[model samples]
Target: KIEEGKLVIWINGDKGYNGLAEVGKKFEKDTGIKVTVEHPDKLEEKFPQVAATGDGPDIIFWAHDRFGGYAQSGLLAEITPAAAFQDKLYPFTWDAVRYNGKLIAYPIAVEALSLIYNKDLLPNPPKTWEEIPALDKELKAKGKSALMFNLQEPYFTWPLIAADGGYAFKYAAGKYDIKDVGVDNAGAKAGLTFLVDLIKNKHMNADTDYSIAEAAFNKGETAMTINGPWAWSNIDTSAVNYGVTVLPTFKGQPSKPFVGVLSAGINAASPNKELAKEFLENYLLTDEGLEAVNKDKPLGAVALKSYEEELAKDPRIAATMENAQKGEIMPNIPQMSAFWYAVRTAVINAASGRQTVDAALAAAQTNAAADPIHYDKITEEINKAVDEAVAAIEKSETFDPMKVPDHSDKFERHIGIIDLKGELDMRNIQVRGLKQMKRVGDANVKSEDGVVKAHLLVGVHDDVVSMEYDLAYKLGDLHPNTHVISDIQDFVVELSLEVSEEGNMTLTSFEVRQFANVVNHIGGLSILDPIFAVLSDVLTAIFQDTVRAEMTKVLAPAFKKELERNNQ
Candidate 1:
């Protein structure tokens, strides 16, 4: 199979992928190589791990930003394109595949964010950031929003900072200088404070995310939105007459957008490198191949310079290229990982009024300086302290019973039980759906004899007949027994709650202070009758123990808190 040129191409489900599937089959037919296209779910995260152990597909199809890290980490094969090959594609696409001066992939589709506006609502777009407030006020008066975007996403918010002098790192000579972070400086504060003002003026809310922003624009609720080509298919073209333009100017400078590219690369450890190279250069790079791959939807300005005239004809593509030219190329360095989350958090905190703009920016700057090794060291120290505290707690007064106060409580609530053929099930015994059961007795308790004495007033409902039948069945099971019960009120038993020196409580001498033979029904059954009553006696003891256990569980925490507070 290795000699016969069998290879797998792992790709995502979206884009012009179906068209590419046909292209793959065509490659196999023409070259006598077995090529299979596989849609590996979440290829972005999955491929890195799978490919490292040599279990990944021959070729990987994904976005370009990951190419730099993959190439540097030796996860991708170095792809050196010929002079003729390099000339066919647009110059900017080369920047996407190159990391540390090495080519790692073949760029395919280009994407960039642009300002899309409603042609009907906003006939003339405002040129500068200063003009937005008045337009926003006017739109709000008419129950419409002037602009909206995913305030939480750094991709949408980063432009505000980039439009000024703020940057994640000082990019110089093709390398990101991580030591020079510009987020907390004056430029970033200027941008962040403007966003806070927008929130305060009710122009946009902190809760706006991708779905809400897109829905508002599609429903004609907002006049403008900052989005990329991926959102074009979801827009309501019938309801909203929209047009694309470059991002608005901020402080006399154009708002800089980040450009992304979709690309294809080969796994470094793939055995069939020659076949993969042949497929990418011959099949995928050809005009027919590129056409088939983009037949479903014109994704963007295809990376090929030969397709420029065709792309320029589409208004969306034209606007996309224009904005991309005006924007800065998104950095593909590993240092960029530190910038996104911290900056997004700063934007959220400032806009949501959780922190002032200055404080938020300062906090974001502090977060951006984090190093993995330093964090690991801090984690070890914290874990050591926690383990010592836990050991001390296990050997403290809180673990001893004699050092704590005795907690007790009496409940006057209804107690009932269900008997399913003498197999007792206590859960939901008091109430069965839409039906009320007969109560056995009223239970009471008070301090007496250095312990608690519980008195039960028996309702002699179904006394004689059921008690005898239950005893006969308990002696040896025979038949089902039923007895009609009436309201007969009398005191049945005085159960004492005796406490030991260790503060443990238990019910003692149930028959000592009661009448000779008094019977009571619990939940429509004579289950609490005291006359060698086997099932009722066992069930009654369980019910009383459950009550005492639950009381301690519920009141122990309250009692502890009160003691600690009083001592304090």
Candidate 2:
């Protein structure tokens, strides 16, 4: 009954699916095994039916959360890879795919939530979730909302539940026990009560839907919102400058979100089991294959450590991964189904004041018990295990907090004001500035001075002429004629790197020296013109500030991490 020549793989029609196809081609060529990647409708529900008929795929790609139901139904094969092979993946990813203590899938992508904030509104993110209530007043005074999020959704609410020492079910004997529903527990009640008070205090309301919340953020009406990496694409920086951080601690405990892993599993009854196993273990799990899989989607947080340093270069990716490092992997057990809807209903009722917090939570426990799949009696043995799970979930990771650099990089601009007699008004003024620099030679370290110095060739291409200026206007402000000047190039920066007493490598000093007094461009303007010197200083300051901000916001974190490594 075993097939030899062809192998079929089923995946959803997402961009990630396209990436897999690209890898499938190389696999086909390498092994002479024809690969047929299918995108069937309702793949999750239909997979069992097809597998029963013995015509299912050799491999199926999906989210690890779904592996529970499939594994329970005997639709997924155990991923029995070599010990070394298993060791190559993230430890938490294996936790995501484990069903009845069996590893059921190969983990690919890791996903978790991070607090995305408007950097312009909040210069720094809140240190604790407790700070939110008081910060709400400050935001409202400034004509902005404190926070906006979809409170109706269980995914977002689960973090708070865990933070408050409540869980969907208890993990006992290395698996989730359905009987131990903790929705009506004291922790759950407290968490729900805290949320309800927010609604009562006019911080947020039941009327705030996902679209409404997102629109508010886009329009710059809210200071912060809880979202994921996927939400980054929808944000408009022109409206609200954004930054991401780990979710603040609640009641002095880490607010641990559920981490989900996107994975691929083999069909339990696949005829070519060995071939499928080899292809996945040897081909797809490699660095090249992993890179291809993330080519289209760019898994902001990947599961493999080999890829972490490279992906961490992306600030959004780094933030999400850092938060995830502190999170608990979502339990992939069939009993998880009983928890979602019941808890969602309870939260909705409590937030909208349809029922008191205690009453709504009691109703949830009843609803959960009514499920035929949920066992009503939780064993004392299971309760002890539940306590251990909660403790582990609340555990925090050690962090080396590094301060970001503030003053770095310099810019010079030359502007010309031609026939400056009338009032000038510009409708759409835009200035583009670019500074590119790289180390030109090897670093030289002086033994006596304890200093490392390197010369960097910096190129300056400041575009000040692109802005529009109106010679004469009437509605409100200043009216003066201004002219654009050309950009400059050929600049150099002398850098000195030294290790501080804190065991961190720092740019101790940098000099913005070695550039000509004047440069030529589209609009011929002379830096030698003394009348333009005053304007040039203002323009230079603005450009330097912009460069410094970009560096601090984007490059500084990555640089700091690398600096720590080098010093160590």
Candidate 3:
């Protein structure tokens, strides 16, 4: 029953995912929670379908780029990092996991492209693109191509196309202004022209796809190929001597490639959010956890400051890290689809000699601007559906949360597992307008020494649920008399009831979830306490028990009368 707790992580068969699983064992031991790993076969389709209503794993372990859509669609929960660990994160991560200015994920690794050149063919890689022509001729004499990557792939070739100043989107005032397309700017025109010139001049092969590029580089047919850390194993397996460095400067400007990050995100409507946060802050951010991660995944760069010196020891990792420092976090907004489409189309048009760079880019700008995702319209439609649905919950319920103020204060509390006796006044109720409900896990009845034990939790709080109310509490002189304003951001009410073979029943434990904040407190415990372990104890003694008793007085008698009419 409720004695054993479990949390599930949705991840794949990757070594890093497995590494996190190994780390979870200790977390399970420290707390009475079990952490399990799973990779759904059709996650891209299933995640959206299931996670939308919170019927998914507690955590989703993957790259950060796809999370923006999930977050905007209200699928991912906004996560907060412990202040101590937050400051220790890398600059790339400071906003890598942010969506709509809210932190929705936690970064673990970073990936960026770099110059992977054969040390045998060229003692030193060219420092600038201006030097490529001479080296192209020099390398051609030795039966080798100087540079090759998937020229049509915007992701691989973007550094060359953006060597001047082209960006996927205009990032300003802390957001990517989707309306401002930069692909056709003066700087972009120059960069794309230079890329096309290299191909036209026979410096690079037009057949240089990603697979062809990696294969040729490994076979020593190419002197250089721009690649990321993920390609190291394939090339190094060929036993070729190579060195990795930042992409060459172009037109006196350092090339800045697009960088991607990998991270973990919590499901917004998950019932185990507090437990998930505890795992993230306590286990996922630790050095031991990252060590397991790197041993398995071996990423280009790490996002924690603790890995700086050790990660730089590998020259390849250092080079990618250097490029990452110069690079921009790849735009993850939904509108970015238009950018990718436009850039790839323009590259094909210009590089294949069908059109000039200017004409191709000009066409791209117009198409991209026209093809933008209508986020506002999407949000409006979503709001309409959710509002209408929530409207149904209100219509179906008889309890008016707003009128909680008018209820009598005389209290004698004994309901379920909770037991509290206090006079309470509640007013100014606010419930954030919409509510989503979910059953977190299974509840099984257990027989412990001939007693049947079973428990279930019904959660009601903001993200998954949110409510606010002002309340005053007073006990019969034993402790603190309190008046406080508290927002019930997220909470769970667990009913742990047990029955013996003698047919005697008793309610046992009253536990509530965490992350609620009250303006102030009276006794040694305060609702403002972040952890809420002690606060739940204080609250269970003064809040839910009494409230449940009052509600039962209104509901039980009528419920029994209706049941008697149906049964014998």
Candidate 4:
């Protein structure tokens, strides 16, 4: 019997196309098997379709957390390692991918949670989570508030969940027990209760966005908050430096850090399984391959054996890996769905005076307990049980994919050559994160099957701009009927800046500022204006060292090119 020659594999699509393209090409060359590698246009739809297929990929490289339902439904094939391979892999990495007695996946990268903080803020990592609250109380007594936390967000909520000794699903004798939801566990109740008390009493703010939280840290508003590396890349770190450490222990138990994995899993349905596996083995695991990924991206593999070398080669990965050892694989069980909902409700309830900490947690625990393990089948059955007349929403045909997207900046073309004449020193952080574009003729439109698809354009600029600017436009397609961004062009940024004898410059009518005091006040300087006159003195003090460093590194090159393109 001959297996099909084509292998279809799916992966989450951040660096997917690139990683698989390299692997696919090699696999075809090595094994003469055609590997059709793909990922759905959206991750929300990707997994379901693959799982529903009887002949899905032979392997899949994805988060272990979401594998519970698929594995329970027998949607995956077991993968056992030959004795040699078993000994080399990390224990937790292997354990995370197991279902029943069968090993269903292999380790590619590893993830775990740990505490990251502004280094200048914390001289010592607290030995226990309790110490933090105690310290917060002490700080308050001294007249200066000690810290604040964002309880409104999931990013920080996970830590509180961990500190509370709550398990997503307790993996008991061969199966997960959702009946014992830990969201309302004693530890979680205490931890969450304490957090809410701090927030309501003004010890912390629970509603900070990424920028606000980081800004608070930089401004020394609060001592620390729990966050991961996902948002670290965009942090404004010039003001105050930061550091990483293990989460403090709560009670006598260790704070189990939730780990996120970035790995290469073969598609079980891929025709080129043997070759795809080989490609993963040869390239993905190689020095160049791993180094490329570890460089400038999220945390890389958790293989301790490669840590020293990977970190030594890429200094940026140093801090992330340094704390990797402390991470626990964030569990991936089906009941995890109800687990989070319960935890969140408990957290909010505790945060508010709506319920006592113990009561809130107990409520959450009850909800999780009620979430039957047969949730999938039950939900389907419930939906079917409903009379057709009452199931009105499902029968609505008004839902159309062609609808306009939200946050869209008009379907029409808005192209104007931006100019920065005097003192047009665009902030590096702003420029690096922003996408500047030169417009197309404004007449571009995409057509499919003889029907007009979308108004589009083809713009080109620097390759850096493509990654920084146009890539976002391309990714915007992920959401349809919300916003249709069919085309984006990086057609050279055209602009320039000029300074007079007195060092005054012009950049459009936006007005130019030679004095640091004045430049920091544009738009009334939405930055530090909350303090009025104090902002000038603050900007004056930190202007030269901090702002100048940003210019030299981030702004100068991009702005200069934009200016040159404009003049050309």
TM-score of each: 0.60, 0.55, 0.57, 0.51
* C-alpha RMSD of each candidate structure in angstroms: 20.5, 26.4, 28.1, 22.6
- Top TM-score: which candidate number? 1
Candidate 3 ranges with C-alpha deviation above 4 Å: 1-58, 61-65, 269-283, 353-356, 370-568
Better of 2 and 4 by TM-score: 2
lDDT of 1 by residue, 1-568 (tens): 2223587887766566677878888988888787887786657656776777766888898768666666766889888678888988987788788887788889887887888899999988888776888899899899999989999767787777777767777878967787778888887788788878988988888889988998999999999999877667667454888888878888987777677787899888888888888898888877777778766434577787776546568788788988788777767765454465467767877887756988877866765655211222223332333233323433544322212222222222123552323332232222001011122322222232444233232122334212111211222253333332112123122223333334443434333122233233543344444322544455445334552244334334433343233232
Model 2: per-residue Cα lDDT at residue 105: 88
lDDT of 1: 0.63
CA-lDDT, candidates in order: 0.63, 0.63, 0.66, 0.47
The candidate 3 region of ten consecutive residues with least summed lDDT is: 437-446
Pairs clashing within candidate 2: 423-479, 423-480, 424-479, 424-480
Best by lDDT: 3
How far out, in Å, is residue 438 in model 1? 42
- What is the Å distance of residue 339 in model 4 from its true position? 2.3
**Mind giving the per-residue lDDT tens digits that candidate 2 earns over 263-365?**
8888888877788887787777777877886765555566676775567788777778777777777677664545665677678778876569898788777
* Ranking of candidates on lDDT, top first: 3, 1, 2, 4
Error of 4 at 419 (Å): 82
Model 4 collision count: 43
Reference-based TM-score, model 4: 0.51
Q: How much is 525 displaced in model 3, in angstroms?
A: 99
